[PDB]
């Protein structure tokens, strides 16, 4: 009956051939293969739900490509004559800058006692005004030369930015073997800072970032010494992550003002929100999230909260569980650096006359940098959903067909046959 | 009739079972699944024609492996006494070297006016002869020490090459922790060049490349300063690209003399052809493509053409559309550089007596380099044709079999049945 | 008969339809597709046995991650006053240290003749005791400052290790922008070594490695000069290899004491075994493999054997054939280094008073290092068995079903039908 009609292989022999050996043997093979189908399909479905993925890598030359943004800060942060009689500022800036650098601060120290006593008295003091006026600055005396792809550029092409290093200036703000070339005058005789707080090195610190991202110096910025010429070759490396089941991304999350999401952006936004809860003001190093806090509130309100946030781990990053998951698309600019003695014996005496300064000054103040695109200047890494629902529906077809030659229509036939029997 | 014979599932129920509920319901399921097959197969075929690809990465230690070729140039390009009374050469070389470095040249400048007036008069002048004789050279006084895998090597092991930096010498021309060790004497007192043209740094510039490729310094070469010891660890990174439909490669294109194709080689060959069209001679910095041009023709014929070629973008690179597509196989040598103070207080007085020169001279002239193979010194990235025609023919079989249990024979049966009906 | 029962498509037409055109044509299509099945399946099986693989890449931020171990050595290896009257030690250490550095040694040289004459006489001499007492040491006078994630650390946190550089000390032995910060005092006035043997540079040499691996300096260690501050950013890059058929790994091999396998560990264990065969003692630079050899046996027994081992290539590495195959899991710490002038003009006079030494001493002795984790501090590369037996059994099902709609049950039916005919 159903054996002659069903397309399930084997069963037709069971009824059609009634020989004892065949009538019994054929059913055994039917049972044997049928149980094999269930195991194989089970393995297939089990593997699918693990959410496997595979990656694709592309590397190419991009003749005309968008140069990134680069921000520069002086390793000496304050004007020498603006801090000679106002040494308290180093501890005040340390406390105030605790938002960006989370390095802890030791209470009862001599420095922290002087600053606290000062803040309680000089409540008018505006740290932002002081640091803006009495810090590093881009000027004809500070940026001796600069060129972008052979076109001269001026200090007016740099946008000012605040950072734990004080005033910082970013270039290119919002071809192989070509890029940005600069020449700085660190002017150690004019800019200084406290060495007792760990600021001993002299030079320029910079970070290369996308124009849409706020630079994050921390302990991550690159360095360049005085008296050497640094050649930096950068390559753009982009990576794409799948959503939570396949990757750690989470496109649902969006930052304030619906701005493009970035892991660093979430952390800054996350911290700013908490500080605005415990205290009614936000530090000026987190610009757009509200009002600026007074000097005193840094010691009383903002400082304890930052310790609490770190202590309770309220700003986790990374996994999708984290408050700041990995971004869907990550853009990175790996760099390799080589050095040459910048002032040559011929050039040393040429610059000495041109800049009207002694040769000793030149060797100790001038920093020369050169950031270029390599030849193979592009690379994309893609995470791919190895198998989709359409892809799985093919694999299950092969196994089911291979061992039994069945089909979804065959299953319906069996169910109908069982229903009649019931 | 055909229902009892066709293997297309479902239809057998339509005719065999004539019950109103079943006779109608079964056809509905047949129609439902049949339309599902077309959508799924359409998605499969649509995805196939996108030419997807997947990559494979292999990393391994190669005990005995072919060391690449390395070429060195002095950052000071001319002998001091050969150019003291012949300062015009700096602008002459700048104009002549415009083939390699495409940096533009400002007309009406004082330097360019003197050179042009000189060229109009000294038409006998042979720039190649001058630069070859009056430039950098490898000698016992310039290459103090050199060793390759523990075997001493001599200046005779270096092959001379012309470059925008003048005379350049390449080593190894056509094991972990071992490689090439060198010690140079830049001799700033003997080699100089114009700082007003942007040559201010002193040291050695070199590039690591395959022995079959002409070095391309441009703004891509690595640097090494005087008075420091540079340790460079290299790793060979090979990548393979599929043909145009799957990748950007194009194996059909081949260079002159059927030489191995390379993106840089195509650019040089492309430029040489155009210059030979507008002008009857080729610059000597493009060696094998014809005759050498006179000094005057550089100012009159070659220089304007290069601007035109860049202006019209006649030498695009990268995509398969480009005149110089990406090579099928790319070999790259990423490098990481570390530095130490080369002359120690003990060695400084040892070299002072050995070389019979003052300690000040040693600190400002000697350059020490060391290029080594890392432990994990190899890596291959392969682009693979994810699905071939054989691979696709399995996926289409699974979907067709799964939802209808049909086969290419089943389709022929339907066509024949329709033909009889027609 | 069998045509009406077999599920192999096409054959049913052969018997059922007896029209000359159809009776013959249908069999032709049956034959045509059947031969196509064999070719397609043959291609599938042939491709499977090549053992293809595909790779997956994951990159993420790890907020709290295990910092690696770092070991430091001084580029000057011996105390100046301990070797002034005992200059033979340089050649003795060169011979003894030949186990780690395999650089050959020239017999009949003046140095090797003095050392050999000394060894034959001073057979009591214990090289291990001398180097331990009369070498580099970590001390308050040598490690001026050190901090780990903001927590001060002391010389007692470093574990002593022997190396070709003499005494070496490893930190962290068995968060983004944070790590290890150090300040060394190379004290060139106290440590020296032979420049005639190729030790001319002064500074610090270090290698970053997993805590479970013995450091391998060789020509692979990183460098840091005196008078500059080096910022090292590291990222953990882990790779996994499949077994021999798919990759070069070989999990069966295990080291002595069933310790975790590592390519470098196998080489050290391999060499130690051979030396213990030809000679009855093992060098103390291979610690755990047996007894220490006498001073004389280094010249007589150990030295010739090492040449023989290298000459006969008894310690191959890499491929699964090699005596020391690639490890199943490889952990690597790529690093990028940037530099700044360490003593600023403000800090130079601050440290001069603090350390009670002249400014010239500071510039020539102090080394500052800083090893940090980057933001994207993790990465895993996985090699995957592209197709398993379950995966293959789907592809063979699609091809067989597509062209003939057959199944493993169909094949059995044919075999039984042929048996009856036979
Ligand atoms: C917040 C703050 O400092 N406010 C002061 C206020 O107390 C003082 O009376 C006034 C005149 O000097 O200047 C302002
Ligand atoms: C020197 C001075 O006061 N201002 C200069 C200005 O003269 C110059 O045109 C500009 C472009 O470099 O840079 C600024
Ligand atoms: C995080 C952020 O951008 N917040 C801004 C805020 O600073 C601004 O005052 C407001 C009005 O434009 O829009 C929003
Ligand atoms: C709130 C939250 O995400 N908690 C996570 C949980 O989802 C995850 O399963 C576990 C890892 O096993 O780590 C924790
Ligand atoms: C052109 C120029 O700037 N010349 C200066 C001069 O004005 C100054 O008096 C002297 C000493 O400082 O150095 C030089
Ligand atoms: C191309 C060129 O310069 N040719 C000159 C020629 O004009 C001159 O007559 C001859 C004798 O000096 O030397 C050569
Ligand atoms: C010094 C001189 O004039 N020529 C030397 C030669 O003596 C030496 O044999 C060779 C190998 O280094 O290098 C060159
Ligand atoms: C691009 C290239 O190599 N062209 C060469 C050419 O220089 C040479 O003169 C000719 C004869 O051998 O063969 C071809
Ligand atoms: C001549 C040529 O290749 N032109 C290309 C075209 O092939 C390509 O499709 C298009 C991108 O959409 O860019 C342009
Ligand atoms: C062996 C040697 O080269 N000695 C030289 C000597 O010839 C020379 O006169 C002196 C000053 O130039 O320097 C030293
Ligand atoms: C292996 C060795 O050196 N052994 C010596 C031995 O020969 C000597 O008699 C003894 C007394 O000095 O010291 C020990
Ligand atoms: C100076 C001396 O002899 N020993 C010092 C000890 O006093 C100090 O407590 C320790 C931690 O830095 O380092 C060591
Ligand atoms: C390679 C290695 O670790 N060998 C050790 C050996 O040094 C030690 O003496 C012995 C007893 O613990 O165990 C084993
Ligand atoms: C003992 C041993 O492994 N010998 C190998 C062999 O297995 C391998 O097939 C061949 C490469 O073709 O290289 C050799
Ligand atoms: C506090 C201190 O160490 N002072 C030293 C003093 O003892 C020494 O005599 C002098 C010259 O060496 O240098 C200073």
Residue numbers in the entry:
A (entry chain A), B (entry chain C), C (entry chain B): 40 to 213, 224 to 471
Authors' description from the paper:
The bile acid-sensitive ion channel (BASIC) is the least understood member of the mammalian epithelial Na+ channel/degenerin (ENaC/DEG) superfamily of ion channels, which are involved in a variety of physiological processes. There is, however, a conserved architecture among other members of the ENaC/DEG superfamily. These trimeric channels resemble a chalice in which a large extracellular domain (ECD) connects to a slender transmembrane domain (TMD) via linkers at the membrane interface. In this study, we used single-particle cryo-EM to determine the structure of hBASIC in the membrane-like environment of lipid nanodiscs, confirming its global adherence to the canonical ASIC fold. By determining structures in the presence and absence of Ca2+, we identified a single Ca2+-bound, non-conducting conformation of hBASIC, as well as both conducting and non-conducting conformations of Ca2+-free BASIC, revealing unexpected Ca2+-dependent conformational changes.
To investigate the structure of hBASIC in its resting state, we performed single-particle cryo-EM analysis of hBASIC reconstituted in nanodiscs in the presence of 2 mM Ca2+o, revealing a single conformation with a global resolution of 2.89 Å. Five N-linked glycan molecules per protomer were assigned at sites predicted from sequence analysis and deglycosylation assays confirmed heavy glycosylation of hBASIC. The overall architecture of hBASIC in the presence of Ca2+ adheres to the canonical ASIC fold, a conserved architecture among the ENaC/DEG superfamily of trimeric ion channels. In both the Ca2+-closed and EGTA-closed structures, this ‘glycine gate’ is impermeable to ions, with pore radii less than 1 Å and ~1.2 Å, respectively. The HG motif of the re-entrant loop points directly into the pore in the Ca2+-closed structure, obstructing the pathway of ions. Analysis of the Ca2+-closed hBASIC map revealed a cylindrical Ca2+ ion-like density at the apex of the channel pore, a feature that was absent in both EGTA maps. Docking a Ca2+ ion into the ion-like density in the Ca2+-closed BASIC map revealed ~4.0 Å distances between the carboxyl oxygens of residue E440 and the putative ion. Ca2+ inhibits channel activity by directly binding to the carboxyl ring at the top of the pore, stabilizing the closed conformation of the TMD, which in turn locks the β1-β2 linker in a conformation that sterically prevents reorientation of the β11-β12 linkers that underlie channel activation.
